[PDB]
Amino acid sequence: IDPFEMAVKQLERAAQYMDISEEALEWLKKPMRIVEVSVPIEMDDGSVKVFTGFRVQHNWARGPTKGGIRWHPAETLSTVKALATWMTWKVAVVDLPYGGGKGGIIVNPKELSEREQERLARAYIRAVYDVIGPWTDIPAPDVYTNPKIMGWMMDEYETIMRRKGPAFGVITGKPLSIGGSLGRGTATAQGAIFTIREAAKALGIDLKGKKIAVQGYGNAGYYTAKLAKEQLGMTVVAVSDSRGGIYNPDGLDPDEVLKWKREHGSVKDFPGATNITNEELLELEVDVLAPAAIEEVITEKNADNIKAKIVAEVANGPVTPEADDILREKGILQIPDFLCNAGGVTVSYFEWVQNINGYYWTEEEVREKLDKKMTKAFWEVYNTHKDKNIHMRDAAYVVAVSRVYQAMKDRGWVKK
Ligand SMILES: NC(=O)c1ccc[n+]([C@@H]2O[C@H](COP(=O)([O-])OP(=O)(O)OC[C@H]3O[C@@H](n4cnc5c(N)ncnc54)[C@H](OP(=O)(O)O)[C@@H]3O)[C@@H](O)[C@H]2O)c1
């Protein structure tokens, strides 16, 4: 209830800033397809247990739906619907020929063995084959899913389809040995770095030697901090895990920080540096701020203390709308959540193109194409933000929903 209602409220807020017909808004409120299936597997003890799987294709006007799969024991149908709703305009803003999709299974993979995980993935594919495909619905990695599981899923889809078409293209995020694409690990970070560089160029500020404060030191956060450090010439000054944050004015090299975290389970007490909580970490005076951690991290309470000129929210909605408004009134250029982390879905689209075309690119071509796509999308959103004189999230939403609306009108779905 809560996630889908939040998503539809955000869609209404975005739509009231532009001229969109009521019928189109009502159509976009309801996802096109919802598939709730029972996924049965045989456990290692011999018993047969059935889980509940959801596959929501929110829209496919612009093209085949693209959406991730989450294996976590809490999400429900409404959560998957809201995430597919987000995926729709996340692929729309990047100007991809994709619709919005999402997948999930109510399951806790912590206690599932490797054989059990493989059986669950294969049975999920067997259940949802009738509504997925290379040209209809492309699954993507998400929470608690890895390239191994979706290599298994692609194998099952190939077995069912009898190798009639491009099986490798049914699912993305696959291992490089079987249908994989270069740059998948660094996709989100690369997209975020491209967006930060474009925002800096828009603001006319040089990034040579500037300061970046990154909250959240996961895979995406670490790669963002590193890619900033070398590519942007930026001085990394803040990285935080779930335990605490690390500060040093002179600069941090993410490699040894990651080694320390892997050695002792956390980055706490890094040599030659001070320990600061994430709450005061968001209060640093830097040039770039990157929240790459738990969502709704910047709230209305601490929004007044934010001083970074450019903030790029890698995480999914880590800034509350009120805090977003307070950052807007402070002259702070803020990259939308679904535009900053769109590198992952853009690289997944590139992987799908490689699979369907039968031609595999090098990391150089993938990086160049991701750079071009990010630049074009960001500057389209930036021009919209100046033209309509509304916040950057709303500009990105307007661009994405306008693209989806135009796709619907061209297909004849909506006559208004
Ligand atoms: N075939 C393949 O290519 C393949 C297969 C398997 C794995 N992999 C790779 O192996 C990795 C698996 O690990 P992961 O991606 O799950 O790592 P992660 O989520 O970034 O974090 C590692 C673990 O630490 C916890 N954690 C959460 N937030 C954290 C933070 N800020 N700092 C430190 N720890 C935190 C997480 O559990 P909680 O959040 O619940 O505390 C998680 O289980 C993947 O990134 C994937 O690329 C690849």
State if residue 318 touches ligand 1 by the CB under 6 angstroms criterion.
no
Residue nearest to atom 42 of ligand 1 (CA): 218
Measured in Å, residue 70 CA sits from the centre of ligand 1 at 14
What is the C-alpha separation between 376 and 157, in angstroms, rounded? 35
The answer to whether the beta carbons of residues 371 and 195 sit under 8 Å apart is: no
Contacts of 308 (CB under 8 A, 6+ apart): 213, 284, 285, 286, 287, 288, 289, 332
Closest CA to 381 of 402, 365, 363: 402
Residue 415 CA to ligand 1 centre (angstroms): 47
Distance (Å, whole) CA 81 – CA 36: 11
| Known binding-site positions for NAD(+) | 216-222
Helix 343-357, helix 187-203: angle, nearest 10: 120
Q: Ligand 1 atom closest to Cα of 151?
A: 1
> C-alpha distances in angstroms, 104 versus 25, 67, 173?
26, 10, 16
The ligand 1 atom at the shortest distance from the C-alpha of residue 217 is 31
What count of other Cβ atoms lies within 10 Å of the Cβ of residue 196?
A: 30
Is residue 242 in contact with ligand 1, taking CB distance under 6 Å? yes
| Cα-based distances in Å from 93 to 100, 117, 182, 221, 270 | 12, 34, 23, 22, 39
**CB of 383 closer than 6 angstroms to any ligand 1 atom:** no
Distance separating alpha carbons of residues 252 and 274, to the nearest angstrom: 12
Task: Tell me the three state secondary structure of residue 153.
Answer: helix
Q: What angle do CA 2, 109, 56 make, to 5 degrees?
A: 40
End-to-end CA distance of the chain: 29
Residue whose CA is at the smallest distance from ligand 1 atom 41? 242
The helix (H) or strand (E) run that includes residue 92 is: helix 77-93
Coil, strand or helix at 220: helix
Beta carbon of 191 within 6 Å of any ligand 1 atom: no
- Among all chains, which residue has been given the structure tokens 């474009």? 198
- Cα 361 to averaged position of ligand 1 atoms, centre (Å): 27
- In whole angstroms, what is the distance from residue 10 CA to residue 393 CA? 10
Calculate the CA 314 to chain-centre distance: 8
Ligand 1 atom nearest residue 144's Cα: 16
Cβ 107 vs Cβ 71: under 8 Å: yes
Query: Is the CB of 241 inside a 6 Å radius of any atom of ligand 1?
Result: yes
CA of 147 to the centre of ligand 1 (A): 13
86 close to 12: Cβ distance less than 8 angstroms: no
Task: Give the count of beta carbons closer than 10 Å to the beta carbon of residue 316.
Answer: 14
| Pocket of ligand 1 contains residue 217 by CB under 6 Å | yes
CA distances from residue 317 to 6, 294, 297 in whole angstroms, order as listed: 11, 9, 9
Ligand 1 site, residue 108, Cβ cutoff 6 A: no
**Gap between the Cα atoms of 222 and 217, Å rounded:** 5
Distance CA 112, CA 191 (A): 33
State whether residue 389 is helix, strand or coil: coil
Q: Are 89 and 20 in contact (CB under 8 A)?
A: no
Q: Give dist(CA 88, CA 85) in Å, integer.
A: 5
Is 169 strand, coil or helix? helix
- DSSP labels for 73-91? SS--HHHHHHHHHHHHHHH
Ligand 1, atom 43, residue with closest C-alpha: 144
Do 63 and 99 touch, CB atoms closer than 8 A? yes
The experimental method behind these coordinates is: cryo-EM
Q: Ligand 1: which of 153, 155, 242 to mutate, judged by most atoms within 8 Å of the beta carbon?
A: 242
How many whole angstroms separate alpha carbon 17 and alpha carbon 303?
24
- Residue 328, token pair as written in the block: 């807007």
Using an 8 Å Cβ cutoff, are 215 and 291 in contact?
yes
- Determine the atom of ligand 1 nearest the C-alpha atom of 219: 20
Unique residue bearing structure tokens 């995020």: 173
Active site residue 102: yes
User: Across 225-305, where does the E strand assignment appear?
Assistant: 235-240, 245-247, 274-276, 288-291
C-beta neighbour count of 378 within 10 angstroms:
28
52 token code pair: 């509940």
Distances (CA, A) of 205 to 195, 298, 309, 336: 14, 24, 10, 20
Q: How would DSSP label each residue in 305-317?
A: G---SEEE--SSS
DSSP state at residue 39: E
Residue 352 to residues 172, 216, 361: CA-CA distances in angstroms?
A: 6, 29, 12
Strand partners, 236: 212
Active-site hit among 81, 102, 174, 373: 102
Binding residues: 216-222
In this structure, which residue's CA is closest to atom 21 in ligand 1?
A: 218
Q: What's the resolution in A?
A: 3.2
Q: What is the CA radius of gyration of the chain?
A: 21
- Tokens 């993979």, residue located: 109
Query: CA-CA-CA-CA torsion for 367, 373, 377, 379, nearest 10 degrees?
Result: 70
Burial label, 342 (beta-carbon count in 10 A; 0-12, 13-18, 19+): buried
Contacts of 144 (CB under 8 A, 6+ apart): 70, 71, 72, 109
Instruction: For ligand 1, pick from 118, 146, 188, 266 the residue to mutate: most ligand atoms within 8 Å of CB.
Output: 146
Please list, in sequence order, all residues whose beta carbon lies within 8 angstroms of the beta carbon of residue 381, skipping any fewer than 6 positions away.
Answer: 93, 336, 339, 392, 395, 396, 399
Of 40, 39, 31, the closest CA to residue 67 belongs to: 31
Ligand 1 within 6 A of CB of 219: yes
CA-CA distances (angstroms) from residue 385 to 25, 200, 339? 21, 16, 14
Of 344, 352, 367, residue with least CA distance to 179: 352
Task: Quote the ligand 1 centre to 268 CA distance (angstroms).
Answer: 18
